[PDB]
Amino acid sequence: SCHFGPLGWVCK
């Protein structure tokens, strides 16, 4: 998964 999150662009 890749998305926008706390640290700009975030992937998990």
Give me the helices (H) in 1-12, please.
Answer: none
Q: What are phi and psi of 4, to 5 degrees?
A: -95, 135
Give the distance from CA 6 to its chain's centroid.
7
Determined by: NMR
Q: What is the spatial distance between Cα 12 and Cα 7, in angstroms, rounded to a whole number? A: 12
Q: What is the spatial distance between Cα 7 and Cα 10, in angstroms, rounded to a whole number? A: 6
Q: What is the spatial distance between Cα 9 and Cα 1, in angstroms, rounded to a whole number? A: 11
Any idea what DSSP says for residue 5? E
Q: What is the spatial distance between Cα 5 and Cα 11, in angstroms, rounded to a whole number? A: 8
Q: What is the spatial distance between Cα 2 and Cα 11, in angstroms, rounded to a whole number? A: 4
The angle at the Cα of 10, spanning 5 to 1, to the nearest 5 degrees, equals 110
Q: What is the spatial distance between Cα 8 and Cα 12, in angstroms, rounded to a whole number? A: 13
Q: Does residue 10 sit in helix, strand or coil?
A: strand
Which two structure tokens, joined as six digits, stand for 5?
A: 């999150």
